[PDB]
Design an enzyme around this catalytic site. Structure first.
Site, PDB file in Angstrom:
ATOM      1  N   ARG A  40       0.810  -1.190   0.000  1.00  5.18           N
ATOM      2  CA  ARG A  40       0.000   0.000   0.000  1.00  5.18           C
ATOM      3  C   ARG A  40       0.836   1.228   0.000  1.00  5.18           C
ATOM      4  O   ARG A  40       1.984   1.222   0.428  1.00  5.18           O
ATOM      5  CB  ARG A  40      -0.955   0.019   1.183  1.00  5.18           C
ATOM      6  CG  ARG A  40      -0.414   0.507   2.517  1.00  5.18           C
ATOM      7  CD  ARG A  40      -1.477   1.405   3.209  1.00  5.18           C
ATOM      8  NE  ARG A  40      -0.992   1.922   4.479  1.00  5.18           N
ATOM      9  CZ  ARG A  40      -0.910   1.194   5.594  1.00  5.18           C
ATOM     10  NH1 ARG A  40      -1.306  -0.080   5.614  1.00  5.18           N
ATOM     11  NH2 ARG A  40      -0.438   1.745   6.703  1.00  5.18           N
ATOM     12  N   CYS A 100      -0.379  12.830   7.610  1.00  2.00           N
ATOM     13  CA  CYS A 100       0.492  12.462   8.715  1.00  2.00           C
ATOM     14  C   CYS A 100       1.978  12.380   8.279  1.00  2.00           C
ATOM     15  O   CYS A 100       2.298  11.716   7.306  1.00  2.00           O
ATOM     16  CB  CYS A 100       0.065  11.125   9.305  1.00  2.00           C
ATOM     17  SG  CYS A 100       1.048  10.732  10.738  1.00  2.00           S
ATOM     18  N   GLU A 109      -8.206   8.958   5.019  1.00  2.63           N
ATOM     19  CA  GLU A 109      -7.201   9.719   5.790  1.00  2.63           C
ATOM     20  C   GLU A 109      -6.407  10.571   4.816  1.00  2.63           C
ATOM     21  O   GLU A 109      -5.806  11.561   5.197  1.00  2.63           O
ATOM     22  CB  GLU A 109      -6.279   8.769   6.583  1.00  2.63           C
ATOM     23  CG  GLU A 109      -5.006   9.411   7.212  1.00  2.63           C
ATOM     24  CD  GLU A 109      -4.145   8.430   8.082  1.00  2.63           C
ATOM     25  OE1 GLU A 109      -2.949   8.759   8.277  1.00  2.63           O
ATOM     26  OE2 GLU A 109      -4.647   7.355   8.555  1.00  2.63           O
ATOM     27  N   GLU A 162      -5.498 -10.363   9.392  1.00  2.00           N
ATOM     28  CA  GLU A 162      -6.178 -11.634   9.005  1.00  2.00           C
ATOM     29  C   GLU A 162      -7.115 -12.098  10.135  1.00  2.00           C
ATOM     30  O   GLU A 162      -8.264 -12.456   9.890  1.00  2.00           O
ATOM     31  CB  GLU A 162      -5.175 -12.758   8.666  1.00  2.00           C
ATOM     32  CG  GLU A 162      -4.389 -12.547   7.361  1.00  2.00           C
ATOM     33  CD  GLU A 162      -5.151 -12.952   6.091  1.00  2.00           C
ATOM     34  OE1 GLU A 162      -6.017 -13.870   6.147  1.00  2.00           O
ATOM     35  OE2 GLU A 162      -4.855 -12.352   5.025  1.00  2.00           O
ATOM     36  N   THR A 183       4.361  10.606   9.411  1.00  2.00           N
ATOM     37  CA  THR A 183       4.883   9.238   9.292  1.00  2.00           C
ATOM     38  C   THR A 183       4.711   8.674   7.883  1.00  2.00           C
ATOM     39  O   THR A 183       5.356   7.702   7.529  1.00  2.00           O
ATOM     40  CB  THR A 183       4.190   8.258  10.237  1.00  2.00           C
ATOM     41  OG1 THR A 183       2.795   8.204   9.914  1.00  2.00           O
ATOM     42  CG2 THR A 183       4.369   8.669  11.688  1.00  2.00           C
ATOM     43  N   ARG A 208       4.330   0.820   1.989  1.00  2.00           N
ATOM     44  CA  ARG A 208       4.337  -0.320   2.905  1.00  2.00           C
ATOM     45  C   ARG A 208       4.238  -1.565   2.068  1.00  2.00           C
ATOM     46  O   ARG A 208       3.135  -1.922   1.665  1.00  2.00           O
ATOM     47  CB  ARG A 208       3.074  -0.332   3.770  1.00  2.00           C
ATOM     48  CG  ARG A 208       3.221   0.165   5.127  1.00  2.00           C
ATOM     49  CD  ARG A 208       3.592  -0.925   6.096  1.00  2.00           C
ATOM     50  NE  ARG A 208       2.490  -1.815   6.380  1.00  2.00           N
ATOM     51  CZ  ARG A 208       2.556  -2.830   7.239  1.00  2.00           C
ATOM     52  NH1 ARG A 208       3.654  -3.062   7.920  1.00  2.00           N
ATOM     53  NH2 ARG A 208       1.512  -3.617   7.427  1.00  2.00           N
ATOM     54  N   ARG A 217      -5.497   6.533  -1.286  1.00  2.00           N
ATOM     55  CA  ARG A 217      -4.815   5.404  -0.694  1.00  2.00           C
ATOM     56  C   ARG A 217      -5.010   4.257  -1.646  1.00  2.00           C
ATOM     57  O   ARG A 217      -6.140   4.013  -2.112  1.00  2.00           O
ATOM     58  CB  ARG A 217      -5.396   5.078   0.672  1.00  2.00           C
ATOM     59  CG  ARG A 217      -5.009   3.712   1.190  1.00  2.00           C
ATOM     60  CD  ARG A 217      -5.668   3.448   2.501  1.00  2.00           C
ATOM     61  NE  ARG A 217      -6.070   2.050   2.652  1.00  2.00           N
ATOM     62  CZ  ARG A 217      -5.519   1.172   3.500  1.00  2.00           C
ATOM     63  NH1 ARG A 217      -4.493   1.509   4.295  1.00  2.00           N
ATOM     64  NH2 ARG A 217      -5.993  -0.075   3.546  1.00  2.00           N
ATOM     65  N   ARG A 237       5.034  -7.688  12.971  1.00  2.00           N
ATOM     66  CA  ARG A 237       3.964  -7.694  13.943  1.00  2.00           C
ATOM     67  C   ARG A 237       3.373  -9.087  13.937  1.00  2.00           C
ATOM     68  O   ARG A 237       3.806  -9.933  13.173  1.00  2.00           O
ATOM     69  CB  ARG A 237       2.876  -6.692  13.555  1.00  2.00           C
ATOM     70  CG  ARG A 237       3.342  -5.321  13.015  1.00  2.00           C
ATOM     71  CD  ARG A 237       2.151  -4.524  12.446  1.00  2.00           C
ATOM     72  NE  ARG A 237       1.396  -5.361  11.511  1.00  2.00           N
ATOM     73  CZ  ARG A 237       0.484  -4.938  10.621  1.00  2.00           C
ATOM     74  NH1 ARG A 237       0.182  -3.630  10.472  1.00  2.00           N
ATOM     75  NH2 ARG A 237      -0.116  -5.849   9.834  1.00  2.00           N
TER      76      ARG A 237
END
Lengths: 383, 373
Positions: B126, B277, B226, B319, B279, B286, B230, B314
């Site tokens: 993404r 944002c 956001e 999922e 970040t 990603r 995206r 993570r």
């Protein structure tokens, strides 16, 4: 020497200005209110929107700042119809008159030509506030007040908030006698005091409601906020909560009289100590006192009793009466207890609405007793 | 009133960030505020608009340090550079002097990226993008947002091929489509989390937002959640190369069609692509896979390698239902300093080693010499 005033004129809202930026028509920014159920959507037209969209208060509040909360909150087809807008500052009403007059009319049935009377808080002119604690369990009188010359919560800076807190706590600082009490800022609240305020019920916390938030009335929290209560613990003042000032005189028992004496004396004296500093309450000549929400104007006064009516409840004409008396009921309790108050807010003075409460309550108890004794109340109903 | 010194005013309008725990609240000195307090971008974005979300969201000591500030438009960065440069450095370990290279979406230069299914259970890439010239979600008007929709939807409309798809605006969403999009896991709703509400990104809902997804349903795009754009390319199994192919072609084409109509992407010269944002910067990419490291996972130097590979991990993030035990979301850690495909290459080079080491353990042998020295 106002450089700072000129900056906000242009920059309160830190949002892009669609209108100035070369070309966008007012139509291109017009909100889509098809699915909306609030007074703002009902009363807003693209003509009004064209009229006002680029029109800015001297403080720098915009029309979009005023109506945003209603755009953001379409509300339910089933739930209550919210107001859907806010005053950003003392100028917002005059400045967007054509629109706000249409909401005031819908909200308070108050026409553009109507006139809210002067303030009257002469508690000595109140006739008959004492009730048997049997029917009246507790009573309180609340209102909201804004500080003149300062933006209202929706559009105010940390600095103004700070100003307002300094002004109002200093003013409460000078209250005396039965009205003396201390101030608790929220920023510096030790848990030792917080424990107590939670016990008294005097503590307010950060708003999480749709309106408060979306309006911007929970910014920079807890900065500028605080509680004040007198030493008798029957007269409570909140600061920068929803409005600059929120006062509540309240106690257990049927003595509404004393509740109002205290409230009137407090509010008069605070206005007066504010005046010894060159600060006053935000007051419009037509609409009475102002607060952020267009429902809180005129007197901004809610007087209520917690009334126990075990026999009157079940009378069919109970509501037609309550409404006849220009009162409203909050909470078919098995305890037969109701929160009864003045419906009105504009068009009468503060001690008139109080007297409206008292008058109503007298009639209400007279029937509860009568019905219980088995007698008729049909000729007691106001015609 | 304030017949004040601009100096005295900033003193009297400076936030107390004592009990705050966010980047903004750690990099914001009183000097910086005093300097930038009344500086305003060409689109009317103020400094308080940028940091409000951090003020209003002090964040407690249980949740992890959030950013606590936002870009309101493309000018915001450069406009309050001395502020934003320290945040960027805390968030990305990307120094003021550092530069992010040009964009690189040539999927044909991606070496490898087809992994065994036995190991790679899914993968996806993404990013977010902003349309240039227009304000970001925190500050944008309804016109701007309406505008962003026409432009991006028009572009998406021209994706021929395996990238063919239809738009689904939320505003005039019927119930069969809602029911479907939900079903596919493609719908988003009005945000209720702090960052997006307190930051101004949930305004005027649903006006201007929509969903678009190709007919293979492996290339997803959100309009005005956001961010302006995206885009997600995702499928199950281990064909990362295919995922990156789809992603890059869709992206490249979209930009190309938008260029065709006089719009573009928000690109800063030092920091790359810009989003609300901080970040979300640089490539804004990603890339990730779901790796099943039955053996690597219980290894001492496992996190050490992940670190040296500039990869993040993570639990099997989202999922989220059945027994899926040695599976982790391995993604590229970095966002700045490397091109869009160099990062995907970083993902592929890592996962390769990760897998390599998993097998070398599986065979009972040492992986000590594989781990980057």
């Amino acid at each position: 020497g106002s450089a700072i005033q000129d900056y906000f004129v242009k920059n309160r809202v830190g949002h892009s200005k669609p209108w100035e930026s070369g070309k966008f028509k007012a139509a291109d920014n017009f909100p889509d209110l098809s699915k909306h159920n609030n007074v703002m959507a009902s009363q807003l037209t693209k003509e009004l929107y064209e009229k006002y969209w680029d029109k800015v208060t001297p403080n720098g509040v915009t029309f979009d700042k005023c109506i945003q909360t209603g755009v953001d909150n379409p509300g339910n087809k089933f739930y209550g119809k919210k107001t859907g807008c806010v005053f950003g500052d003392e100028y917002s009403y005059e400045c967007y008159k054509e629109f706000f007059d249409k909401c005031i009319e819908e909200i308070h049935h108050f026409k553009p030509s109507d006139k809210h009377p002067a303030p009257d808080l002469d508690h000595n002119k109140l006739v008959g506030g004492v009730f048997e604690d049997k029917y009246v369990k507790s009573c309180r009188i609340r209102c909201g007040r804004s500080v003149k010359g300062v933006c209202l919560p929706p559009a105010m800076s940390r600095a103004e908030r700070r100003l307002v807190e300094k002004v109002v706590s200093d003013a409460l600082g000078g209250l005396k006698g039965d009205l003396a009490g201390k101030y608790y800022p929220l920023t510096t609240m030790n848990e030792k005091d917080q424990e107590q305020l939670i016990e008294d019920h005097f503590l307010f916390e950060k708003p999480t409601g749709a309106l408060l938030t979306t309006s911007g009335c929970a910014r920079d929290w807890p900065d500028g906020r605080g509680i004040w209560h007198n030493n008798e613990k029957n007269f409570l003042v909140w600061i920068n909560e929803e409005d600059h000032i929120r006062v509540i005189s309240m106690q257990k028992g049927g003595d509404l009289k004393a509740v109002f004496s205290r409230f009137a004396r407090g509010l008069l004296e605070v206005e007066r100590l504010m005046k010894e500093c060159g600060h006053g309450l935000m007051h419009n000549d037509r609409l009475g006192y102002i607060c952020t929400c267009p429902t809180n104007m005129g007197t901004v006064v809610r007087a209520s009793v917690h009334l126990r009516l075990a026999f009157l409840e079940k009378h069919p004409r109970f509501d037609e009466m309550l409404g006849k008396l220009r009162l409203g009921k909050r909470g078919l309790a098995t305890d037969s207890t109701y929160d009864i108050s003045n419906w009105a807010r504009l068009g009468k003075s503060e001690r008139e609405l109080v007297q409206v409460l008292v008058d109503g309550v007298n009639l209400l108890i007279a029937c509860d007793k009568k019905l219980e004794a088995g007698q008729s109340i049909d000729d007691m109903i106001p015609k």
